[PDB]
């Protein structure tokens, strides 16, 4: 019974070709605290992240995810999960080289995403002047930007959603709370080891790419903060993809923006739907279900980015939107033909 072996998503690393601008996004707009700098990397936490960092920004020639690490529910759970992966012929490596954390198992998803498992995590203790009167809160909410509380979840792009889902289910004990299917093909899976709808999702890469990041998400817990965040991004020249609105899938209040390095960042409002029922069936969204899945309100997710752009991208975001909006390309048409039309021409999709 692996169900309870993974506790939560501890941290993630973003690659940025504009590391200072990425850093300024996370500090000046999202009010994250800087806890460490070393080499070409800067380490940040939200004010309610429990460990010394949840986000690592690393200078790189391209955008994308350096890794994501999940924290286990015990040291024994870490041994059981690492052994399951090894016995499943997954190549792993043991490391202990990150500030604030100990012994870490590194491996790749079936599509090449860098994933990590750990137990050993230091509990962040604030300097006295940053301690909160709220005792569950390890540091005061900053006075900068619209500050995020913590990391929320990860959305991976895969050439094969089922292979990534089966890895999380079989080796990590995750359940799939919700998925989107087109005939017999899984094009999205939302997975969790706890009450959350998901901490890890996987969506089909319609461009044939491998091992990409769709988005990293941070948590506000309040829908208004997405309204405040989008008004900030609009007036301070950050590109907005879609939202604020509410996904039918997970019932999460969402806002998607592009940080200056080109990674897609999601801001999450109200937690939404907690999976208290311990043996709920997977909810499967068909193409007849699909419209509400994307957005309860009037929001339209752009075809030319949402369904096709992740990081690293062989094209700039501008070049990507150009190509997939046809500003035809055989690649763009291949993507269009692989996607079912109820999804492609949904009232919750706009095609530039």
């Amino acid at each position: 019974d692996a169900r309870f072996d993974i506790a939560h998503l501890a941290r993630a690393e973003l690659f940025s070709p504009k590391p200072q601008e990425t850093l300024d996004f996370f500090t000046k707009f999202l009010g994250m605290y800087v806890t460490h700098r070393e080499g070409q990397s800067v380490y940040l936490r939200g004010y309610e992240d429990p460990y010394p960092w949840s986000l690592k920004i690393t200078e790189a020639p391209e955008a994308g995810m350096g890794h994501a690490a999940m924290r286990t529910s015990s040291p024994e759970a870490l041994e059981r999960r690492a052994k399951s992966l090894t016995d499943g012929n997954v190549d792993g490596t043991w490391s202990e080289d990150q500030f604030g954390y100990g012994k870490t198992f590194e491996y790749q998803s079936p599509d090449g995403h860098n994933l990590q498992l750990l137990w050993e995590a230091e509990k962040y203790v604030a300097p006295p002047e940053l301690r909160s009167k709220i005792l569950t809160r390890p540091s005061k909410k900053p006075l900068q930007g619209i500050p995020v509380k913590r990391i929320d979840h990860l959305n991976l792009m895969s050439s094969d959603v089922t292979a990534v889902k089966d890895s999380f289910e079989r080796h990590l004990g995750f359940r799939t709370t919700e998925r989107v299917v087109d005939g017999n093909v899984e094009i999205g899976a939302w997975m969790s080891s706890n009450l959350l709808g998901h901490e890890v999702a996987c969506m089909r890469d319609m461009t044939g790419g491998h091992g990409k990041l769709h988005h990293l998400a941070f948590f506000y817990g309040t829908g208004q903060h997405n309204i405040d965040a989008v008004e900030m991004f609009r007036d301070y020249d950050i590109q907005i993809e879609a939202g604020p609105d509410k996904h039918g899938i997970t019932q999460s209040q969402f806002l998607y923006v592009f940080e200056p390095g080109g990674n897609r960042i999601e801001l999450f409002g109200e937690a939404g739907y907690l999976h208290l029922d311990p043996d709920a069936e997977t909810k499967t969204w068909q193409m007849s279900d699909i419209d509400t899945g994307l957005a309860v309100g009037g929001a339209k997710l752009p075809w030319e980015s949402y369904f096709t752009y992740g990081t690293p991208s062989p094209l700039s975001l501008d070049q990507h939107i150009e190509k997939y909006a046809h500003f035809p390309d055989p690649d763009a048409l291949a993507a269009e033909l692989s996607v079912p039309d109820e999804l492609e021409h949904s009232r919750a999709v706009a095609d530039a």
Copy 2:
């Protein structure tokens, strides 16, 4: 100085070919109180509308606005406004035939919209069991749907925005707070006689049509109520056009839906930007300004309805969206008349 002669938008009448479904939308979803029924009409108010009705639903073979009435700030202001219109060769009629109101001056905008001015308005008094402990609140907030407080504003579609704007400015003393221009052509004007951004707007009908209703708006004052409303509309099968989001123009939180009779209804969240500065210049939105004007967030206003559909429509809403989403030489004529920064804005979906 006509600046202060119009107090507010008192009421509007919608025509509906599905009058019971229209009624059910306003009572079951928007929790409006029914205060009267007469002939082919039902009369409603939101719980903070001050007079016995703000909304009249009238059975008709087509959708659209039967009329809108503005209340003046005094009986003398009513005489001054009616005289200004008469002296400007606007042909008006005096009537006194509506429940809850008295003497009314009826006239047409330059584009044929049925407009009215009145002073005499009964103050709604609730039955004892519906009185509020909040003394400015004339009736308890209902326990039905996501209830609207009151009427908010009117958006008129016109072949000629400037002619409609000039009428409100010159004859009613309105100021234009904000407008959208493309070269020398005004494609929208937002007009007010008070601190509100607007109680009356006028937007260019890009199909060349005349005298249509773009939308009637009702007020919540809370952005969350647009979120609650859109979830209600989504799960109870009302068509949603755009929002919830926030218009840069007026800084209003908006949600646009179609009531079953085909009229566009807007739900307004937070009041937004109050015009306290008594001599602010008109803010002119160009096509370089335009994206934020439509929506601060990621909302996309559909080309195929928002810019082209109003009531009455020579086409059904489904037939309209079919035609303007495609080609039709009429749809292409509309596309060529609209500037591309507006047409291909990141705040427009085709």
Copy 3:
């Protein structure tokens, strides 16, 4: 490792001497669905409660909690927890007499609270016309009142908080996320088996009573809905105890009211602080810590009800408030002397 054996709080039963008024509170104000009636009981769920009921209202001569049931994470977990309790000399009984559920283990807390454990629970299926387009949502959000999504948590009053806490920790595998201490005495414990701050809390009965209910809580997930709920309760004559505000303890947005039968009901806004860190130390609130624990904002929790009234009460709520506000009683003064003054004269207490 019992940590993961309990999944969540499935349901609770309230006793009411005004059963029809209690039912009207939960249906007309809180928009709960009625799924079953049997004997002198009615069974209700919120629109996102997974089983056919989360709330049972039972006619009785006094208010209070008939029982609360927790659902296990497997059938094996139910056998393990029942065996732990039996091996600990706790008297249990096996039953299967409730609509929508199967085999149930009934036992009493160390202070006499009726607690139950079960695995077998039917999944509620709505009639076709009440199914949601939101596939995690088993039934549409109703158009009545400010509807609650689901049951949230339980707050038990005990003569001995530690005895109740040790039962949940040792027999059910709960962790204590937060607690309030006065010297060496635990006067509150907040306990969870999952990411929630708590599904079960226990607070010290300062009157020397045993086995009472402090409150049952339902979930909105949205702070505005506590604002909407309190405005509804205010204008429709429900007694409001405190809030809306936010507890420092759990970081939960709260509103406390009394349902007409005399039970204290809490409405919860935003989920607040999720316990993602699997081995966080218990956070201990002292009397120097205390003010923020009660309320982040300006809310004052009334001494004369919050700290002293639970159900069943030897007095009516009005008689209770009379006695503990001294409208002195040696019993009221005994309660005052047992409570530390930092708690009693906190800026978060009136």
Copy 4:
């Protein structure tokens, strides 16, 4: 017909004996822009204040209101209002000595409050990098604190509420939208020249004092910003008096705090009830009406500060709360018990 002669509340000046801490409160917590410094004063605006300042912070030995200025609807309206006041034997002064503004009429309320009228007001224009894409918004919302949009309203404490009300009604053309009465005594009056419930209120000073400031208020327009603001104030050691909640009177979402200099500041959420009906009767709140007037929710307004403390105060805030938790008893006997022992009052 003076009804339309006053447009809005342009600005106010606060006195502070802790001028730097007061400044830090308005910049670090409330995100106000500093536009000028001169002598012992600093000038600030919210990002949607139309003129170069709405707030002036002035070093002084005691807290309180230096002045409040209302903007008229025309230059002629300024001449008419000034003439009405002088014809009523009110002592007025003409001045033109403030940054961002021109010709000003200064006078005192019947109770000694420093009030001003002006027409001439410069329109603030942001530097290019601070201009908003929202064209009605003259400067970007700052990235600092929970920033206020603009000044909202003023609440004056008076030994005689009726005398202050009569001045605003008869000389400035304000209407009283709502008031609280006890028998034939006005305990509160909420006054407006526009759709707002009020831009000026006056409440009875139960201590027998004269000419005090109860509070100055700033606008968010969003209830959540009061929630965000109170959490900020709680964790950064600002004293919170009451709220967040909603006043039945005006239907305004409110939060009351003390800035470090001792002045009471109110943060306003949703605008609430707009007075569109041009000839609504004044709504009179009795002592049977009273509970909802104070707070729709569970909020309790503290007797020991809310009903008795204003600036300048002969006592520190701490000394005031100490005393009001013969003078305290005189205050208690003058206040009717339905107000004093309301479920919306804490002692």
